[PDB]
Amino acid sequence: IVGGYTCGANTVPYQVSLNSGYHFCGGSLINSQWVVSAAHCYKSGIQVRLGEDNINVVEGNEQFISASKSIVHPSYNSNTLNNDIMLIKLKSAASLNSRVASISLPTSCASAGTQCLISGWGNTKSSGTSYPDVLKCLKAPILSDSSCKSAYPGQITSNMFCAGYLEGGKDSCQGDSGGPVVCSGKLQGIVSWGSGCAQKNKPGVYTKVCNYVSWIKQTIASN
Ligand SMILES: N=C(N)c1ccc(CNC(=O)[C@@H]2CCCN2C(=O)COC2CCCC2)cc1
Numbered sequence: 648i649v650g651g652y653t654c655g656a657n658t659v660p661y662q663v664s665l666n667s668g669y670h671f672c673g674g675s676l677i678n679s680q681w682v683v684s685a686a687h688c689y690k691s692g693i694q695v696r697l698g699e700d701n702i703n704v705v706e707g708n709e710q711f712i713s714a715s716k717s718i719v720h721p722s723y724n725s726n727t728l729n730n731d732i733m734l735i736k737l738k739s740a741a742s743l744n745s746r747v748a749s750i751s752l753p754t755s756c757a758s759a760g761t762q763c764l765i766s767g768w769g770n771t772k773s774s775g776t777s778y779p780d781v782l783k784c785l786k787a788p789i790l791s792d793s794s795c796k797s798a799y800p801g802q803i804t805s806n807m808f809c810a811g812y813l814e815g816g817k818d819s820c821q822g823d824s825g826g827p828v829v830c831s832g833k834l835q836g837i838v839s840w841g842s843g844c845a846q847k848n849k850p851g852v853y854t855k856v857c858n859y860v861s862w863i864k865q866t867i868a869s870n
């Protein structure tokens with residue numbers, strides 16, 4: 648997260664870290680057994696880390712749970728990142744509490760101009776590399792699709808939306824991938840892609856979760 652702030656410990660209780668010997672992506676807990684992340688975060692050998700703030704220190708509210716299965720969207724295209732969404736099932740049910748909590752799926756899409764919260768342990772530098780150990784947050788509005796498509800001609804599908812600031816300075820980045828975009832208490836997006844980070848006229852691009860609620864509900868009910 649570039650241009651953001653330290654969230655504070657467990658103030659984003661649906662935020663997970665995906666670990667394969669190291670943090671490699673974020674995710675969102677959607678019930679005690681399931682996580683939503685980006686398809687480009689797929690790998691096997693995933694451990695889901697819940698209750699995290701500093702991901703390099705055990706502070707005592709963590710739950711580490713191995714994944715039993717992963718399910719990449721059937722229509723995920725890795726060349727264009729269309730349908731960049733994946734579901735991860737926990738081998739054992741998480742213990743929900745104030746610091747480990749699920750986030751609700753949208754009952755509808757969100758509108759342009761709506762303010763959202765984006766969070767993650769990714770790079771905090773626009774040019775260069777600096778990884779935080781504690782969770783970073785950013786408030787950012789949904790941008791118009793036109794502004795979105797203008798920045799990325801020919802690359803935006805109906806399954807994507809932009810959020811951030813066209814002026815630059817504030818954005819998600821590498822390592823925030825798969826993490827939540829929460830608007831009005833609903834999971835409306837997943838950190839997916841962008842050109843660089845926090846660049847002028849290159850806002851972040853997010854998976855449009857409201858398009859997948861049926862697929863998510865049907866997939867977890869059958870798996
Ligand atoms: N500025 C941002 N908000 C931002 C945030 C996160 C990321 C991490 N994502 C990535 O790096 C994704 C995953 C693999 C290819 N990738 C890419 O960004 C570059 O690939 C092309 C982008 C659209 C079609 C493929 C990149 C950018």
Ligand SMILES: [Ca+2]
Nearest residue numbers: 701702704705
């Ligand atoms: Ca920790």
